[PDB]
């Protein structure tokens, strides 16, 4: 099963310098330039965090 699509997997939420959020499998090393802000937690929990916390899809550089 694809690791990003495993509804039973353990996940993080990562954010980059542009404020963009990413789901991430908790078993995998966090890529450079990204910071974990939530998890390990269920996939639905992480997606709910993104829905609640990523309110503006525009990259931060655009807004500033």
């Amino acid at each position: 099963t694809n690791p990003f699509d495993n509804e039973d997997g353990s996940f993080l939420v990562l954010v980059n310098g542009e404020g963009q959020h990413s789901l991430w499998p908790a078993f995998a090393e966090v890529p450079d330039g990204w910071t974990g802000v939530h998890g390990p937690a269920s996939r639905q929990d992480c997606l709910g965090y993104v829905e609640q916390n990523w309110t503006d899809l525009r990259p931060k550089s655009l807004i500033s």
């Binding site: 694809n2 980059n16 963009q20 959020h21 990413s22 330039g33 990204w34 997606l47 899809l57 990259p59």
Partner: protein
């Protein structure tokens, strides 16, 4: 960059070259720019501001091209709506996209949903020509998937990375047939690629482009044409000689069997055949395979190699890069990524994920399987489903 910037270069270099051919009507680059500036002035005059979304409900025409550029000049993004869509999809797309105004024609006026401003493109109004200007990070368009359709938000930089890509090899002498729905991102090739290259857009006559109409267009001077996979397969099996005279035929989207390409090459030794692959989320196409004149395809039609400026990765279930000949998940990175899905932050975070190969960058999860060849081409290996 932005497509308006690339187009402005062509207006400066050759203002009197033909830009758009629509039946009797012919627009030069200068004429296209001037008309778009006037419609842009009408939009600014109404208070349209940077980042606003303007829906578009028009039949393909020179006015369509003018309208799209005009929305861009006003600092806004276009939301293309096919005039053949049923009313519920039109209404959903307009509301979902946050479009507050809709450009239409006399013929399509009744298709504007109630409560949305109808702007009839042929109406003349007391506003001066003006442009706010397009900027690379700003929204250029919102195009909807074939699924509940999702709104893909694409910035100017990504459209320009696609349209201005040197690999298209479109020249000022080229004439590209325009017939795909402008609500589909193949229209980026049919409209913007020729205009940023100095060539001309030839608006197809109303109705579907079949083999007979393709032959007639080629006789009138069309040099390049895109066909959907379904149409290409049908013409390749039924009348492959109908591509004769084209400099290049392009296709992609759905499955194209190698046999279909082989038939066209057999009938048309000199036509370049470009097979293209890519989701709307990465701006029309991310990889392509070009069969040069005289060359034979062989048993498998690759989806090919990333476009210049783009990267592809084939990773296993632990996100490790696999060796050639091993099937894995296909990820697309580098140029051309959308910002994400409108109103769907979670879905965006689920498919535009962190890219381990480039600091701070994202890659789009295609949901497709692929394998590398030893020489760096990609073979499609089905859906991860």
């Amino acid at each position: 960059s932005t497509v308006p910037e690339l187009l402005a270069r062509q207006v400066t270099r050759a203002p009197d070259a033909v830009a758009v051919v629509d039946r009797d009507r012919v627009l030069t680059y200068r004429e296209l720019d001037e008309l778009a500036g006037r419609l842009s002035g009408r939009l600014i005059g109404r208070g349209v501001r940077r980042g606003d979304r303007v829906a578009v409900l028009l039949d393909r025409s020179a006015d369509l091209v003018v309208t799209l550029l005009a929305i861009w000049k006003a600092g806004a993004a276009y939301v293309p709506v096919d005039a053949g869509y049923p009313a519920p999809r039109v209404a959903f797309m307009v509301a979902d996209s946050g479009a507050s105004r809709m450009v239409c024609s006399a013929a399509t006026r009744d298709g504007v949903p109630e409560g949305i401003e109808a702007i009839v493109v042929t109406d003349e109004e007391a506003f001066e020509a003006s442009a706010a200007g397009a900027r690379p990070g700003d929204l250029a368009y919102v195009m909807y998937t074939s699924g509940i359709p999702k709104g893909v938000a694409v910035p100017h930089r990504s459209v320009a990375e696609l349209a201005g890509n040197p690999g298209w090899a479109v020249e000022p002498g080229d004439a590209v047939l325009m017939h795909a729905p402008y609500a589909f991102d193949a229209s980026l090739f049919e409209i913007w690629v020729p205009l940023v290259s100095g060539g001309r857009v030839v608006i197809a006559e109303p109705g579907p482009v079949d083999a007979r109409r393709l032959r007639e267009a080629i006789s009138s001077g069309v040099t390049r044409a895109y066909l959907t996979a379904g149409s290409f397969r049908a013409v390749a099996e039924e009348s492959p000689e109908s591509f004769a005279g084209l400099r290049e035929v392009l296709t992609g989207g759905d499955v194209v069997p190698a046999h279909a390409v082989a038939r066209v090459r057999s009938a048309c030794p000199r036509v370049r055949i470009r097979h293209m692959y890519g989701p709307t989320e990465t701006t029309m196409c991310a990889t392509w395979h070009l069969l040069e004149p005289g060359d034979e395809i062989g048993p498998v039609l690759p989806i090919g190699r990333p476009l210049p400026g783009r990267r592809a990765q084939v990773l296993d279930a632990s996100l490790r890069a696999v060796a050639p000949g091993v099937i894995g998940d296909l990820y697309l990175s580098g140029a051309g990524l959308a910002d994400g899905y409108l109103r769907r932050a979670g879905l965006t975070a689920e498919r535009f994920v962190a890219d381990p190969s480039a600091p701070g960058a994202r890659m789009y999860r295609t949901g497709d399987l692929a394998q590398w060849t030893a020489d760096g081409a990609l073979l499609f290996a089905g859906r991860a489903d």
